[PDB]
Design a protein around this nucleic acid. Structure first.
Ligand code: ZN
Lengths: 314, 101, 132
RNA sequence: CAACUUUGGGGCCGUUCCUUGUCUAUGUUCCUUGGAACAGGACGUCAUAGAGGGUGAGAAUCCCGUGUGGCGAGGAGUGCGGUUCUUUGUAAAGUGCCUUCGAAGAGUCGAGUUGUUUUGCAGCUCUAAGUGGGUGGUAAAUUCCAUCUAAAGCUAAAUAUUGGCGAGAGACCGAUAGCGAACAAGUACAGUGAUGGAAAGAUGAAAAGAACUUUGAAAAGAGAGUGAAAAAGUACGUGAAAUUGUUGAAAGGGAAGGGCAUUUGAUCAGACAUGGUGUUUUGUGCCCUCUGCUCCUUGUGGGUAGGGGAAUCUCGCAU
RNA sequence: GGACCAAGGAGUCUAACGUCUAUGCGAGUGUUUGGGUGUAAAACCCAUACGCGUAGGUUGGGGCCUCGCAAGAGGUGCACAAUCGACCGAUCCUGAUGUCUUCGGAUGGAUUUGAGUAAGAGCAUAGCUGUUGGGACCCUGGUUCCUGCCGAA
RNA sequence: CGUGGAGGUCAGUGACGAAGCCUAGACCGUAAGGUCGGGUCGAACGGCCUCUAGUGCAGAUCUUGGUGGUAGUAGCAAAU
């Protein structure tokens, strides 16, 4: 919630200029909506499959037709409300700032200059792979890249021999305002994926519907994010779109609970675990101590021995 | 944001969290003092934090402030603990003065 | 019925935790009403038009009361004159939000409502008129 | 009549298109394991190349490629771009104004009937008009207005495509699945025919496929050997159950099974456990002292050097 | 109904209405026929249309306020319900001012009327489910994991 | 609880042995089941948060394959 972020050089140091937050990072983070949108968006790049039309006669039979011949007209793509999809992207963008989320997904960002990490626009003008990799070394995302590079494993499924042989983790995401050969330079290094600010792919944003991929920004892209999503000051550049509101202003509930004035208005609390009373029943008519927590007359009753009392001879 | 970050970590994927056969959860967070992944336990869900942790020989107290939520390279503060057991516990109580139990 | 929100909005569950701390630790029936209202479905949370809010502010002795809507405050252009008052709710349509702000009033969230009235001092709760 | 305005045809060389050909990065660096490093560790280089495949196991860097560009070759061709050669002969065309004219789909339209279709179509019979005809609204009604030119013809593109010729993919199936057919599958086979129609994938990295001796008609053996492995021998990856043989144990004598609980017999598991507390001896160091250097998150900080001392203290360590 | 054993083997998909729930927006809502874009069946942006919807009183009464130590009292009253209303449309009579000799409805009645007015709630997506139809669980017979809770005729 | 496949993650496991098989071996689960030892074996495979389904068998005189008894019996072109 700080106002501004120091841009960093390609050599990697606090450049004296700083940029205000684009207020997109103040968006509500709704992982339920990100999840529901992510399922339907992940269902988009799908090719259909089917069994043969006519190609005994039993589902139980060897070589017969199967039960439920899989037909093509089963639904493949899923229609999504456009504001809802934009809302999921906005929650993803706001989640990328936090970086407890980025560590919570699994990234090696423990030695990076700050969050959200912003580099100069000169990064865009790099057109060779080794220079851009050395630039990310100078940033400090080297450990994330080494994680991705070590993480190349072979797929456990049958889909290994369905052209999906290798698998590995995902790494940094570089956001540029404009290509100047950067997307060719980072194409060869694994785990890195670039994105114009106009697109900002949700699948690239929250992979596996887990919020907060490690995202690197260029300087012009970070300014351009205000153009892309708007603010209370800049309009939206999207037709009739608004960065959506919160239903609760303060993100911390325990701050509100422990503030001062709720703490004034509230009755005193219990022990925070219940003091067990009467864990076991001790019978009277024996155990004379629990007989004496009852009926204090019983002591002088036994003292006078009235149970054996001799009556008058009258 | 800490309770939002916590409910993301809890109800969705905490990458460090390991599920026991018992049902209990375990963060592989290197700064986590207890082994568990609970509300007090995740260093990711809490901005005031502390941890006894050893680098090659010497044991260091690691302090985490909300003041440095950004800049995670400069996040952890390091204190060299004494080899005197009593003195180092006293040092803990000093640096965690006015701090939670 | 529901003892919990069947929704999975995280912020909603945060407000449920806050108002369950209130409804345990307060003695006013207000926070109990707020907790029971937080569990309601979308059908059981009908929207409240701002026309109905102003018609409610036509009640006697209510002008210095605040109004609370567990639900959505929606706009209606059928009204012109809207008083300067304080409305707390879950959701605000931008038309109704501009009606409240443009009338000099105040658009409040329920966390700020709990901060202002922990015991529900001097309040009003309105429910949308359900038909189907 | 007044002006204007215009010229066509070749060539050639490029270009464009097709079909090709060729060139264009970086480790085979040390160690361990392994039959084999393409595995693991350490140190690297390339990248507009970390797609994919092969190479005795997960190969960016071994090879082919991949990526980026480059150089060709042979055609197609008017698409245009330059050059070059010619093209006129009262040649062809266009625009405005004036004058004089100003010709079009008949066995068709239509009508009846029959069948057919849900109004067309077909048959049979009849069969027109030329300010004509077709079609539709309209009415204050001896109506007005609208809108096209039938009975001659051609026409790219947007479209369909379970076939052909090719590509590229898959949240598809993984050998009873997927095509009937991963294999010498429309095969073997069956039917007189029309037709119907199977089963059947895996030695190994390399056949290195078992030299030689011997039994044995011959089939099969036994010695021997290859191989990392025949607990891989062309019956061959792995090798479940049903079922079979031998041996051992036990039980049974025309005995059926389980459940509980216990003995007996057989049998298995059963510390790499070996420490803590206090005291004491001596020695050592981030212990003490003096002299530094260095990183910022600049503090209740972090790293680090030199010499001296435990003679005294003190911490940790060792003893 | 059964010689045994292995593998295979039976409520799938789609369309149309319907409830519920979740989500976004909200009197609006719906990007993806299509165009632009692209790292290319993904994502991103969207012009014009179109679709569906929109276009008074009394009694209580959640609460809330005040007073009351409390108990309670008073006030304002959400949703919703009942009453008495009102009005619109209908209903059957009245049939005026006018009236082209058959036009006219003025006024006053009367009951019910109606998802009527008297200050909206919908649209879209997803999920689970109800009915119907496509071969539609498979071929009378069969119909594939556990536990907990509720549990008839 | 289990099964095939998919997204993310565990810089998860693996030729010093994955998966599979056997296990008069141990353990945890009320159970569905899961974990380990040992043996065999040779190249891939798992846990977690989600998605998706051709997702769970004892029967259907189910389909296909394999193997019994009948039985050394019937019987000798029952196929040669
Ligand atoms: Zn955790």
């Amino acid at each position: 919630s700080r106002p501004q972020v120091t841009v960093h050089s390609l050599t990697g140091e606090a450049t004296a200029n700083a940029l205000p937050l684009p207020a997109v990072f103040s968006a509500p983070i709704r992982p339920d909506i990100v999840h529901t949108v992510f399922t339907s968006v992940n269902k988009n790049k799908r090719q259909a499959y089917a069994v043969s039309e006519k190609a005994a006669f039993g589902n139980m039979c060897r070589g017969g037709r199967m039960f439920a011949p899989t037909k093509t007209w089963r639904k493949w793509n899923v229609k999504v409300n456009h504001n809802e999809k934009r809302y999921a992207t906005a929650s993803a963008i706001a989640a990328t700032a936090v970086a407890s989320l980025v560590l919570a997904r699994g990234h090696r960002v423990e030695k990076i200059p700050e969050i959200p990490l912003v580099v100069s626009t000169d990064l865009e003008s790099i057109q060779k792979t080794k220079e851009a990799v050395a630039a990310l070394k100078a940033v400090g995302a080297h450990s994330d890249l080494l994680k991705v590079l070590k993480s190349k494993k072979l797929r456990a499924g049958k889909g290994k021999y369905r052209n999906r042989r290798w698998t590995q983790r995902r790494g940094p995401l570089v956001v540029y305002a404009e290509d100047n050969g950067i997307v060719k330079a980072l194409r060869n290094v694994p785990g890195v994926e670039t994105a114009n600010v106009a697109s900002l792919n949700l699948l690239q944003l929250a992979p596996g519907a887990h919020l907060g991929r490690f995202v690197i920004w260029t300087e012009a892209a970070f300014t351009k994010l205000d153009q892309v999503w708007g603010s209370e000051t800049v309009a939206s550049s999207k037709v009739g779109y608004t960065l959506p509101s919160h239903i609760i202003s303060t993100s911390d509930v325990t701050r509100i609970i422990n503030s001062s004035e709720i703490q004034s208005a509230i009755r005193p609390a219990g022990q925070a675990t219940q003091k067990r009373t009467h864990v076991l029943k001790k019978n009277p008519l024996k155990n004379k101590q629990v007989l004496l927590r009852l009926n204090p007359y019983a002591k002088v009753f036994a003292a006078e021995k009235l149970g054996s009392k001799k009556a008058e001879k009258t | 944001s800490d309770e939002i970050v916590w409910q993301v970590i809890n109800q969705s994927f905490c990458s460090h969290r390991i599920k026991a056969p018992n049902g209990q959860n375990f963060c592989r967070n290197e700064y986590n003092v207890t082994g568990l992944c609970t509300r007090q336990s995740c260093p990711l869900a809490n901005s005031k934090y502390a941890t006894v942790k050893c680098d090659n020989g010497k044991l260091y107290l690691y302090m985490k402030t909300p003041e440095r939520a950004h800049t995670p390279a400069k996040l952890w503060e390091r204190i060299k603990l004494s080899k005197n057991y009593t003195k180092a516990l006293q040092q803990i109580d000093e640096h965690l003065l006015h701090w939670s139990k | 019925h529901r003892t919990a929100p069947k929704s999975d909005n995280v912020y909603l569950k945060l407000l449920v935790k806050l108002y369950t701390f209130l409804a345990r630790r307060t003695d006013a029936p207000f926070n109990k009403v707020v907790l029971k209202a937080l569990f309601l479905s979308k059908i059981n949370r009908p929207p409240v038009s701002v026309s109905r809010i102003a018609r409610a502010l036509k009640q006697e002795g209510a002008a210095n009361k605040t109004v609370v809507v567990v639900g959505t405050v929606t706009d209606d252009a059928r009204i012109f004159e809207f008083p300067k008052t304080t409305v707390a709710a879950l959701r605000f349509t931008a038309g109704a939000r501009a009606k409240i702000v443009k009338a000099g009033g105040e658009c409040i969230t329920l966390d700020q409502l709990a901060v202002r009235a922990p015991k529900g001092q001097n309040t009003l709760i309105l429910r949308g008129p359900r038909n189907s």
